[PDB]
Amino acid sequence: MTEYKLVVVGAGGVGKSALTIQLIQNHFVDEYDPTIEDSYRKQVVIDGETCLLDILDTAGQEEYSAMRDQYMRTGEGFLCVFAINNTKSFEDIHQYREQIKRVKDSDDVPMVLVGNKCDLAARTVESRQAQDLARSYGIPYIETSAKTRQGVEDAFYTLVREIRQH
Numbered sequence: 001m002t003e004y005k006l007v008v009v010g011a012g013g014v015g016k017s018a019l020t021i022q023l024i025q026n027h028f029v030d031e032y033d034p035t036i037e038d039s040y041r042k043q044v045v046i047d048g049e050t051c052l053l054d055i056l057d058t059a060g061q062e063e064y065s066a067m068r069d070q071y072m073r074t075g076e077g078f079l080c081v082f083a084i085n086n087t088k089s090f091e092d093i094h095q096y097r098e099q100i101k102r103v104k105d106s107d108d109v110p111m112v113l114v115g116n117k118c119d120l121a122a123r124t125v126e127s128r129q130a131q132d133l134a135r136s137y138g139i140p141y142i143e144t145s146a147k148t149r150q151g152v153e154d155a156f157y158t159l160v161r162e163i164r165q166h
């Protein structure tokens with residue numbers, strides 16, 4: 001069946017794993033558990049199309065400066081996640097987008113910008129801010145909460161539809 005190779009990238013601690021686990025297992029993991037490299041495969045029906053989502057959960061930590069290219073090279077779509085309460089993670093977004101363009105030798109690659117942790121009150125990254133950025137990249141912006149599950153499916157299905165239009 002149709003398969004979609006998705007990759008979730010972004011700074012450590014932003015909630016990459018929590019988003020992915022909400023999707024696949026429907027439940028919030030509120031604990032410290034740094035990722036090295038995790039892979040998830042689930043069968044789903046998106047807009048009537050039966051398909052297999054092959055998801056690669058990456059490590060936010062520096063030291064995996066090498067195995068970064070390898071996964072960015074085979075991935076068809078990327079969820080670039082930052083945390084709305086972490087300015088640094090938001091700024092690092094540019095850096096991840098560039099590595100993806102470099103590795104795939106392409107300016108337009110299926111991508112979605114994801115502002116996670118929208119359930120928190122202490123917001124340091126305004127929404128219009130992220131929206132302008134997304135607008136200049138020519139990509140969609142979606143705020144999520146792996147905590148309450150808001151916008152989680154939205155984020156993933158949208159990425160899929162972007163790959164579909166590519």
Ligand SMILES: Nc1nc2c(ncn2[C@@H]2O[C@H](COP(=O)(O)OP(=O)(O)NP(=O)(O)O)[C@@H](O)[C@H]2O)c(=O)[nH]1
Pocket residue numbers: 010011012013014015016017018019029030031032033034035036058059060061116117118119120144145146147148
């Ligand atoms: N309040 C709130 N906390 C969240 C949310 N998403 C993740 N977290 C919390 O943030 C911490 C890190 O989340 P995790 O998913 O492990 O982050 P990561 O980006 O995958 N880290 P790493 O890159 O090291 O693998 C956890 O304690 C988790 O519960 C969210 O939407 N809201």
Ligand SMILES: [Mg+2]
Pocket residue numbers: 016017018033034035057058059
């Ligand atoms: Mg993780």
